From a paper:
In this study, two fungal chimeric class I TrTSs, Talaromyces verruculosus talaropentaene synthase (TvTS) and Macrophomina phaseolina macrophomene synthase (MpMS), were characterized. Both enzymes use dimethylallyl diphosphate and isopentenyl diphosphate or hexaprenyl diphosphate as substrates, representing the first examples, to our knowledge, of non-squalene-dependent triterpene biosynthesis. Structural analyses of the terpene cyclase domain of TvTS and full-length MpMS provide detailed insights into their catalytic mechanisms.
Because recombinant full-length TvTS was insoluble, for in vitro assays the TvTS-PT and TvTS-TC domains were expressed individually. The structural basis of the cyclization mechanism was investigated by determination of the crystal structure of apo TvTS-TC by soaking with the non-reactive substrate surrogate 2,3-dihydro-HexPP. The TvTS active site contains the conserved DDXXD and NSE motifs and other residues that interact with the substrate’s diphosphate. These differences create a larger pocket in TvTS-TC that is composed of a tunnel to accommodate two additional (non-reacting) isoprene units of HexPP, sticking out from a ball-shaped cavity in which the four reacting isoprene units are located. The high similarity between the AlphaFold2-predicted model and the crystal structure of TvTS-TC offers a basis for the discovery of additional chimeric fungal TrTSs through structural prediction, which is not possible from amino acid sequence analyses.
Residue numbers in the entry: 2 to 93, 124 to 156, 183 to 234, 243 to 322
The structure:
């Protein structure tokens, strides 16, 4: 039931067969997303430190957030984008808590109850729970507590598909600078990079196909809450958006350092 996003023809995903047949959707407010990325970089330089050669969720045509949370509420896009960009920077001391406080104040002013759920998920660390806090806040979703255990267990497949794809597309630039799936497969099977890569692709397609099927069944049954279903359906655009973004995003392009 789409109100804020747009489906994009990107025929290379069919040839790549990593996202099953999940379409690419992109939030139409890419401009707000970039504004929140710029502000996060301005605050980081202001409070934390200088940034040189850093690239986060910005891609040449769309950003990470607009492809992966395509139905993100427009008035929440900047904040959601800022928080995603800040998590990218944090992953790569007084100012950090000052930036966090500001972000917390902006979130509480938008959605008090759902900022608390989100913060709870973000204190645990597990990257599952970061994306869980961000998506639920970005789309103003309230997962019934009786459904949470089941919803999170189901979403794990989409997190694995996107997580492994990420490592697949980040290994090259990461090696040039390992805690990557390609390296583990190169230990266990003692194989070359391209052979670990083909094994990784097999696993990605398993996880992706299982997720697509489960979400189809749950949607067809309509016995879970609309917010749980909306969260799970966002899991699908997170797989297609992650992959499409990975193709050309500066973060993983060797052309940068």
């Amino acid at each position: 039931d789409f109100k804020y996003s747009r489906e994009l023809k990107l025929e290379s995903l069919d040839a790549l067969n990593l996202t099953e047949g999940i379409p690419l959707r992109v939030n139409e407010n890419i401009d707000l997303e970039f504004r929140g990325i710029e502000r996060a970089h301005s605050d980081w330089e202001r409070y934390v430190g200088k940034l040189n050669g850093f690239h986060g969720g910005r891609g040449p045509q769309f950003g990470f957030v607009s492809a992966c949370i395509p139905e993100c509420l427009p008035e929440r896009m900047e904040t959601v984008s800022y928080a995603n960009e800040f998590a990218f920077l944090h992953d790569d001391a007084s100012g950090k808590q000052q930036m966090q406080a500001k972000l917390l104040l902006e979130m509480l002013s938008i959605d008090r109850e759902r900022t608390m759920v989100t913060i709870k998920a973000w204190a645990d660390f597990c990257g599952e729970k970061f994306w869980f806090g961000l998506v639920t806040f970005a789309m103003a979703l309230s997962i019934p507590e009786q459904e949470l255990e089941l919803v999170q267990r189901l979403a794990q497949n989409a997190y694995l598909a996107a997580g492994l794809t990420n490592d697949l597309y980040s290994y090259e630039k990461e090696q040039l600078v390992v805690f990557n799936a390609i390296a583990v497969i190169m230990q266990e099977h003692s194989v070359s990079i391209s052979e670990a890569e083909d094994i990784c692709r097999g696993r990605i397609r398993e996880y992706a196909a299982k997720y697509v099927r489960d979400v189809a069944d749950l949607r067809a049954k309509n016995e879970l809450s609309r917010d749980s279903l909306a969260y799970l359906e966002t899991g699908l655009y997170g797989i297609s958006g992650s992959t499409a973004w990975n193709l050309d995003c500066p973060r993983y392009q060797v052309s940068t350092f």
